[PDB]
Amino acid sequence: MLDMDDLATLDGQNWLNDQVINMYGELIMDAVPDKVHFFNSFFHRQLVTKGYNGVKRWTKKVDLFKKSLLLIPIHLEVHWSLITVTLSNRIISFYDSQGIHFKFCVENIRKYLLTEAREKNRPEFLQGWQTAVTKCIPQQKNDSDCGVFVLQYCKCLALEQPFQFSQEDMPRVRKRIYKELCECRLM
Amino acid sequence: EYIKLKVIGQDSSEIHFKVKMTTHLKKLKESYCQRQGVPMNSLRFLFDGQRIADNHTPKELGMEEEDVIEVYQEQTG
């Protein structure tokens, strides 16, 4: 569970913080543990500054290449976005609710996956990785809901649902996430 | 019996602990806050990417001598 000032970033139009993001990710991964690995929000920061050696032990007990979907929340300057990795077709996708185009991070992830494939002896994953800024996705219409869009993309992809939501739903998606975090279970 | 641990944050400086393997890490988290003068709920403590809960112990987490705990501060967006 979370403290009440962490949950409080879900209220009204507050900016979500890392406790909401990372606890919801943990919720998703506990709902479908065989298909999804969720990296917490600090993974990409630590990958950028220290490289593979900084995050090598993060997968000491996880075989990423038996998962279907990796979810990597990206904390950029005051902003939440999302990388997903689908292992079946080897696509690294970058999802952003505000139209951001941050090219550095798909290549940080592609380099990580290649190094992890050489180090875990899964050379069938050394070739074939393609990128994609995901087309087609509900966009925010304010300056506060980054984080909520990220978590709704996460929940949709993990449960394999279409992106049937828009900005008008976000107050209610904030209160659903709140409730799911308090009950430690997805709906 | 006791295990040496390194707690490393943004300043990259190593704070060295020597704690019992059976005691709850909540008290390491409290000590580190005090040392750096910030509230405990403003820091996140991770061991190899796993969030350290208050009831976790080095033995339950499989920590070894001079293992590294990373400290991060809150992110918003």
Swiss-Prot record, chain A:
Belongs to the peptidase C48 family. Residues 1-157 are annotated as: Protease. It is found in: Nucleus, Nucleolus. Protease that catalyzes two essential functions in the SUMO pathway: processing of full-length SUMO3 to its mature form and deconjugation of SUMO2 and SUMO3 from targeted proteins. Has weak proteolytic activity against full-length SUMO1 or SUMO1 conjugates. Required for cell division. This is Sentrin-specific protease 5. It comes from the Eukaryota. Interacts with CCAR2. The lineage of its organism: Eukaryota, Metazoa, Chordata, Craniata, Vertebrata. The active site is at 79, 96, 146.
Swiss-Prot record, chain B:
GO terms for cellular component: cytosol; glutamatergic synapse; nuclear body; nuclear membrane; nuclear pore; nuclear speck; nuclear stress granule; nucleolus. It comes from the Eukaryota. There is a cross-link at residues 4, 18, 20, 26-27 (Glycyl lysine isopeptide (Lys-Gly) (interchain with G-Cter in SUMO2)). GO terms for biological process: cellular response to cadmium ion; cellular response to heat; DNA repair; negative regulation of action potential; negative regulation of delayed rectifier potassium channel activity; negative regulation of DNA binding; negative regulation of DNA-binding transcription factor activity; negative regulation of DNA-templated transcription. Its main location: nucleus. The modification Phosphoserine is found at residue 13. Keywords: Acetylation, Cell membrane, Chromosomal rearrangement, Cytoplasm, Host-virus interaction, Isopeptide bond, Membrane, Nucleus, Phosphoprotein, Ubl conjugation, Ubl conjugation pathway. Residues 1-6, 18-21 are annotated as: (Microbial infection) Interaction with Tula hantavirus. This is Small ubiquitin-related modifier 1. Ubiquitin-like protein that can be covalently attached to proteins as a monomer or a lysine-linked polymer. Covalent attachment via an isopeptide bond to its substrates requires prior activation by the E1 complex SAE1-SAE2 and linkage to the E2 enzyme UBE2I, and can be promoted by E3 ligases such as PIAS1-4, RANBP2 or CBX4. This post-translational modification on lysine residues of proteins plays a crucial role in a number of cellular processes such as nuclear transport, DNA replication and repair, mitosis and signal transduction. The chain holds residues 20 to 96 of 101 of the full protein. Covalently attached to KCNB1; UBE2I increases cross-linking with KCNB1 and PIAS1 decreases cross-links with KCNB1. Interacts with SAE2, RANBP2, PIAS1 and PIAS2. Interacts with PRKN. Covalently attached to a number of proteins such as IKFZ1, PML, RANGAP1, HIPK2, SP100, p53, p73-alpha, MDM2, JUN, DNMT3B and TDG. Also interacts with HIF1A, HIPK2, HIPK3, CHD3, EXOSC9, RAD51 and RAD52. Interacts with USP25 (via ts SIM domain); the interaction weakly sumoylates USP25. Interacts with SIMC1, CASP8AP2, RNF111 and SOBP (via SIM domains). Interacts with BHLHE40/DEC1. Interacts with RWDD3. (Microbial infection) Interacts with Epstein-barr virus BGLF4. Cleavage of precursor form by SENP1 or SENP2 is necessary for function. There is a cross-link at residue 6 (Glycyl lysine isopeptide (Lys-Gly) (interchain with G-Cter in SUMO1)). It is linked to Non-syndromic orofacial cleft 10: A birth defect consisting of cleft lips with or without cleft palate. Cleft lips are associated with cleft palate in two-third of cases. A cleft lip can occur on one or both sides and range in severity from a simple notch in the upper lip to a complete opening in the lip extending into the floor of the nostril and involving the upper gum. The keyword Ubl conjugation applies. Residues 1-77 form the Ubiquitin-like domain. Belongs to the ubiquitin family. SUMO subfamily. The keyword Nucleus applies. One of its GO terms (molecular function) is ubiquitin protein ligase binding. It comes from Homo sapiens (Human). The record marks 17 as: Interaction with PIAS2.
